[PDB]
Amino acid sequence: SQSVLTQSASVSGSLGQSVTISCTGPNSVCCSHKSISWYQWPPGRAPTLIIYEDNERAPGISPRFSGYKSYWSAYLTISDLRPEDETTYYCCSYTHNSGCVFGTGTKVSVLG
Amino acid sequence: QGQLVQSGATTTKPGSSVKISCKTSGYRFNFYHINWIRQTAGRGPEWMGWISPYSGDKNLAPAFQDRVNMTTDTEVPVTSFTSTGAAYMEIRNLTSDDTGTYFCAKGLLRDGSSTWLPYLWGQGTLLT
Amino acid sequence: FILGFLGAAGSTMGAASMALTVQARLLLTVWGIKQLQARVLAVERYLRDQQLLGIWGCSGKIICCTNVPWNDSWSNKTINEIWDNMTWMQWEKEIDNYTQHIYTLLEVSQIQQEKNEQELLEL
Amino acid sequence: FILGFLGAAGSTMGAASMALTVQARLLLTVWGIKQLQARVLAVERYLRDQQLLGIWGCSGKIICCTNVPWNDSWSNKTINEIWDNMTWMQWEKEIDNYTQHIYTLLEVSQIQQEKNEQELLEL
Amino acid sequence: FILGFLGAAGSTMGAASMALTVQARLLLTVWGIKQLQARVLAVERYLRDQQLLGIWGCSGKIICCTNVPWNDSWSNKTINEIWDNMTWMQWEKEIDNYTQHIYTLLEVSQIQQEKNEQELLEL
Ligand SMILES: *[C@@H]1O[C@H](CO)[C@@H](O[C@@H]2O[C@H](CO)[C@@H](O[C@@H]3O[C@H](CO[C@H]4O[C@H](CO)[C@@H](O)[C@H](O[C@H]5O[C@H](CO)[C@@H](O)[C@H](O)[C@@H]5O)[C@@H]4O)[C@@H](O)[C@H](O[C@H]4O[C@H](CO)[C@@H](O)[C@H](O)[C@@H]4O)[C@@H]3O)[C@H](O)[C@H]2NC(C)=O)[C@H](O)[C@H]1NC(C)=O
Ligand SMILES: *[C@@H]1O[C@H](CO)[C@@H](O)[C@H](O)[C@H]1NC(C)=O
Ligand SMILES: *[C@@H]1O[C@H](CO)[C@@H](O)[C@H](O)[C@H]1NC(C)=O
Ligand SMILES: *[C@@H]1O[C@H](CO)[C@@H](O)[C@H](O)[C@H]1NC(C)=O
Ligand SMILES: *[C@@H]1O[C@H](CO)[C@@H](O)[C@H](O)[C@H]1NC(C)=O
Ligand SMILES: *[C@@H]1O[C@H](CO)[C@@H](O)[C@H](O)[C@H]1NC(C)=O
Ligand SMILES: *[C@@H]1O[C@H](CO)[C@@H](O)[C@H](O)[C@H]1NC(C)=O
């Protein structure tokens, strides 16, 4: 592991509650001069784009998901935790003509 | 809104080179870039690069430049808004550090600031 | 110039919305009769369009904003996944059912606009 | 909707002035020739109307206020005893003599309006 | 009135620019066919003019100011030695080469005007 973009390690929640996962790196990958994409990614399988351009969701994404980007970090909140939210989440910094600088993952547990 | 089926699970040994396929269907293959990502047992996810089925353009991360052979076919139109194409992924100096799951990812949009963002993923292929 | 006459037919709606006056220019005895027939038909379809733009308050506009709020029953799609993705031809195949409903919504907003404008200049 | 196409023909001018776009829509070989003839005539009478609305500054209007003060020589009747009593057909039979005089008054006010507007944007 | 229909053909452009609605009014079987042919042709040339005025933002104008700065390559002549000397017919024989170039300049200014106007009403 060598990702320059750190997340909130791991975090947990309970049914009906809301979570939040950080995402921040140095001045070279975050944030006021870079977009941020949030990916739901089960272990070694088919991922899913959740949020691009800091606060825009992908098609069909449930309104529970939300984003926010300050000048030094971006956050992914998961309103109304449902049982199908046990997985790991990664972020990514990018512009129009660059690549996805991924994050260090944040496994989320909904045990309740 | 279409499928991106890839090859099987072909495992070779260091120094060699492996070809990974990525056949499209159900969406205009020329309208969206094709990205290549992987998750190796040793790091997390790593972005490798994308290619344009229309512009023929290539942009990869400097970490995978002098190792990746990335190409595409030319879509076979099914309808006015459908097509079927295929992207190809090869690597040069192969090792056991590169062992992991690989997929292709169709771009998000056709314009704006999030055009190439890997939206639609394939199925995954296990390397060496 | 730009691409030309319909050159952005398979282009994104964002790029296609620019330079719309290229398709606004070129829009207007067995041989003689069948030549004059097409001449009268052309003026008809064109006038039907200007007729609509007139009873919408857009007479003389290429891009014309209105009052009717966009009903999500027509399409629950973002501005982003339309103007930077769908082509103009894809789009109106999706609005095809609701096109004759919006046309009625635009006429009431123009009739109920000058009706209010009439009260405005009474003072 | 409202009553329909001409449905307020015998209605008061006050109620008839509402929803005028219902009569603004439906305004635009022996059989073939006599069918094409009516087609060309229709476009003519319609364009003659839009032509007038253009040289009056009302091009694109359904209700259009102007500058010409209402001369009482045309009719010394109140706004009340017109728009809440007379029907549109009764009214213009009364203005029938003065209709070709007001038409001239509206054109000078549009020509002497853009002539002044020209001086306005010289600064 | 004024002089009449084209009465200021050999008059100065300054006096001719006044009362332009006199030439805006009168602008719109062997005998039958050659009579209907002229009828369809008339509506065409007229609509081609209104078509241009529309894609210039002048739809409904007689005198219409724009944005395009007057290039001196077209004519390095003063406002005085034009509008108080040359007649309208003399003038456009001088601009005859550059007339199809200015026409293109007027359409971009109308397309790049409503494109900006679109951004204006987004707030
Ligand atoms: C037909 O349909 C196809 C597919 O739908 C259209 O092709 C796509 O067009 C869109 C918009 O025009 C492209 O998105 C843009 O991508 C550029 C990235 O280009 C830059 O980076 C490249 C890699 O680093 C680089 O190759 C480019 O360099 C030039 O040279 C190549 C040589 O191949 C040339 O092909 C390029 O065009 C370049 O000229 C370049 O440095 C990105 O920069 C864009 O973002 C900018 O613009 C948007 C507005 O458009 C703005 O919002 C941003 O903020 C930023 O300013 C934009 O993302 C897409 O890459 C194309 N290809 C796909 C989707 O596969 C094509 O245009 C259609 N043609 C017609 C006629 O309809
Ligand atoms: C949307 O349209 C439907 C009919 O198609 C109508 O019943 C509904 O009230 C409309 N909603 C809004 C918010 O306009
Ligand atoms: C329009 O109506 C038809 C009815 O058969 C339906 O099948 C079609 O899906 C509708 N189109 C849209 C865009 O809703
Ligand atoms: C009314 O019209 C007559 C001619 O019909 C005219 O002589 C008179 O000056 C006009 N009066 C007003 C006030 O406009
Ligand atoms: C119009 O003129 C005729 C002339 O015969 C006259 O009889 C009629 O009363 C006039 N109409 C009006 C409304 O003054
Ligand atoms: C004038 O027009 C010429 C072409 O006829 C063009 O090259 C030049 O840039 C123009 N100058 C100005 C000031 O518009
Ligand atoms: C137009 O072009 C012709 C080319 O033969 C030239 O002779 C003429 O002088 C030009 N007219 C003007 C007004 O420059």
Report the C-alpha gap between A75 and A38 in whole angstroms. 9
Q: Does B108 touch chain A (CB under 8 A)?
A: yes
Q: DSSP class of residue A80?
A: S
Helix (H, G, I), strand (E, B) or coil at C62: coil
Place of tokens 């691409």: C3
CATH code of residue A60: 2.60.40.10
For E45, phi then psi, to 5°, come to: -60, -40
All structural domains of chain E with their residue ranges:
1-123
Q: Is D94 a pocket residue for ligand 5 (Cβ < 6 Å)?
A: yes
Report the C-alpha gap between C56 and C110 in whole angstroms. 5
Report the C-alpha gap between D23 and B20 in whole angstroms. 66
Cα E64 to Cα C25, D114, D115, E70: the distances in Å are: 20, 8, 10, 14
Number of Cα atoms under 13 Å in the Cβ half of residue A109: 6
- Return the biggest CA–CA distance within chain A: 43
Select from B88, B109, B57 the least CA-distant residue to A37: B109
Domain count, chain A: 1
Report the C-alpha gap between D117 and D109 in whole angstroms. 12
- The tokens of C90 are what? 């894809």
Helix (H, G, I), strand (E, B) or coil at C21: coil
Report the C-alpha gap between C31 and B98 in whole angstroms. 73
- Ligand 4 atom closest to residue D69's alpha carbon, by position in its atom list: 14
Position B92: which residue type? R
Select from C119, E47, E25 the least CA-distant residue to D110: E25
Disruptive mutation site among D1, D18, D25, D83 for chain C (greatest number of C CBs within 10 Å): D25
Cα C62 to Cα A107, C6, C22: the distances in Å are: 52, 15, 11
Q: Is the peptide bond before A31 cis (omega within 30 degrees of 0)?
A: yes
Q: Which residue of C has its CA nearest to B111?
A: C84
Q: Which of B81, B109, B111 sits opposite C15 (nearest CB)?
A: B111
Please enumerate, as own/partner, the contacts of B4-7 that have beta carbons within 8 Å and a separation of 24 or more: B4/B103, B4/B104, B4/B105, B4/B106, B4/B120, B4/B121, B4/B122, B4/B123, B5/B122, B5/B123, B6/B102, B6/B103, B6/B104, B6/B122, B6/B123, B6/B124, B6/B125, B7/B125
∠ Cα C45 C47 C49 (to 5°): 75
Contacts of A100 in chain B (CB under 8 A): 37, 47, 117-118
Q: Whose CA is nearest to atom 3 of ligand 6?
A: E73
H-run or E-run covering C34: helix C30-54
Place of tokens 């000048």: A71
Helix (H, G, I), strand (E, B) or coil at D120: helix
Report the C-alpha gap between A85 and A15 in whole angstroms. 10
Q: Are B107 and B35 in contact (CB under 8 A)?
A: yes
User: Angle, nearest 10°, between helix axes E30-54 and C30-54?
Assistant: 40
Q: Whose CA is nearest to atom 13 of ligand 5?
A: D94
CB atoms within 10 A of CB C106: 20
Q: Are A11 and A106 in contact (CB under 8 A)?
A: yes
Could you write out the DSSP letters of every residue in E43-110?
Answer: HHHHHHHHHHHHTTT-TT-SS---S----TTT----SHHHHTSSBHHHHHHHSTTTHHHHHHHHHHHH
C-alpha of residue E97 to centroid of ligand 7, in Å: 6
Position B61: which residue type? A
Q: Are D50 and D64 in contact (CB under 8 A)?
A: no
Residues 37-96, chain A, touching B (beta carbon < 8 A): 37, 41, 44-49, 52-53, 56, 58, 90, 92, 94-96
Q: Exposed, middle or buried, D52 (CB in 10 Å: 0-12/13-18/19+)?
A: middle
Three-state SS sequence of D50-74:
HHHHHCCCCCCCCCCCCCCCCCCCC
Report the C-alpha gap between C6 and C21 in whole angstroms. 11
- The tokens of D122 are what? 């010289």
Report the C-alpha gap between E41 and D99 in whole angstroms. 30
- The tokens of B76 are what? 């076979």
Report the C-alpha gap between C89 and C10 in whole angstroms. 8
Report the C-alpha gap between D109 and D70 in whole angstroms. 13
Q: Is D49 a pocket residue for ligand 5 (Cβ < 6 Å)?
A: no
Select from D40, C45, C35, D39 the least CA-distant residue to E35: D40
Report the C-alpha gap between B103 and B6 in whole angstroms. 8
Q: Are B103 and B126 in contact (CB under 8 A)?
A: no
B1-128 CATH choice from 2.60.40.10, 1.20.1250.20, 2.40.50.140, 2.40.10.10: 2.60.40.10
- The tokens of D23 are what? 């009569």
Could you write out the DSSP letters of every residue in D25-54?
Answer: HTT--HHHHHHHHHHHHHHHHHHHHHHHHH
Nearest ligand for residue D68 CA: 4
All structural domains of chain B with their residue ranges:
1-128
H-run or E-run covering B4: strand B3-6
Report the C-alpha gap between C89 and C91 in whole angstroms. 5
- Return the biggest CA–CA distance within chain D: 62
- Return the biggest CA–CA distance within chain B: 44
Helix (H, G, I), strand (E, B) or coil at C49: helix
Report the C-alpha gap between B115 and C28 in whole angstroms. 37
Report the C-alpha gap between D47 and B116 in whole angstroms. 51
∠ Cα B2 B7 B8 (to 5°): 125
Q: Are B53 and B34 in contact (CB under 8 A)?
A: yes
Q: Are E58 and E64 in contact (CB under 8 A)?
A: yes
Start-to-end CA distance of chain B, whole Å, equals: 31
Cα D48 to Cα D28, D45, D113, E26, E102: the distances in Å are: 12, 5, 22, 11, 29
Cα D2 to Cα C52, C99, C109, D23, D61: the distances in Å are: 19, 21, 15, 12, 20
∠ Cα A38 A39 A41 (to 5°): 155
C-alpha of residue D73 to centroid of ligand 4, in Å: 6
Q: Exposed, middle or buried, E60 (CB in 10 Å: 0-12/13-18/19+)?
A: buried
Q: Is C71 a pocket residue for ligand 2 (Cβ < 6 Å)?
A: yes
Q: Are C89 and C9 in contact (CB under 8 A)?
A: yes
Report the C-alpha gap between B51 and B70 in whole angstroms. 8
Report the C-alpha gap between B113 and A94 in whole angstroms. 9
Sequence-distant (6+) residues with CB within 8 A of D111 are E18, E19, E20, E21, E62
Q: What share of chain A is helix, strand, coil (3-state, %, to 5)?
A: 5, 40, 55
Q: Name where chain B breaks: residue before each gap, C-N > 2.5 Å.
A: none
Q: Which residue of B has its CA nearest to C14?
A: B111
Cα E98 to Cα D110, E48, E77, E92: the distances in Å are: 30, 19, 15, 9
H-run or E-run covering D93: helix D88-94
> Does the distance separating the beta carbons of A94 and B115 come in below 8 Å?
no
> Does the distance separating the beta carbons of E59 and D59 come in below 8 Å?
yes
Write down the experimental method used for this entry.
Answer: X-ray
Mutate which of C76, C97, C101 for ligand 3? The one with the most ligand atoms within 8 Å of its CB, which is C97
Place of tokens 């024989």: E93
- The tokens of C76 are what? 């629950």
H-run or E-run covering E119: helix E99-120
Select from B114, B40, B122 the least CA-distant residue to B87: B122
- To the nearest whole Å, the CA of A20 is away from the closest chain C CA by 25
Q: Are B6 and B104 in contact (CB under 8 A)?
A: yes
* Domain coverage including residue A26: 1-112
C to E contact (≥3 Cβ pairs closer than 8 Å): yes
Q: Write down how long chain E is.
A: 123
Contacts of C90 in chain B (CB under 8 A): 81
Position C11: which residue type? S
- The tokens of C106 are what? 């635009």
Report the C-alpha gap between B105 and D37 in whole angstroms. 61
Report the C-alpha gap between B69 and B17 in whole angstroms. 10
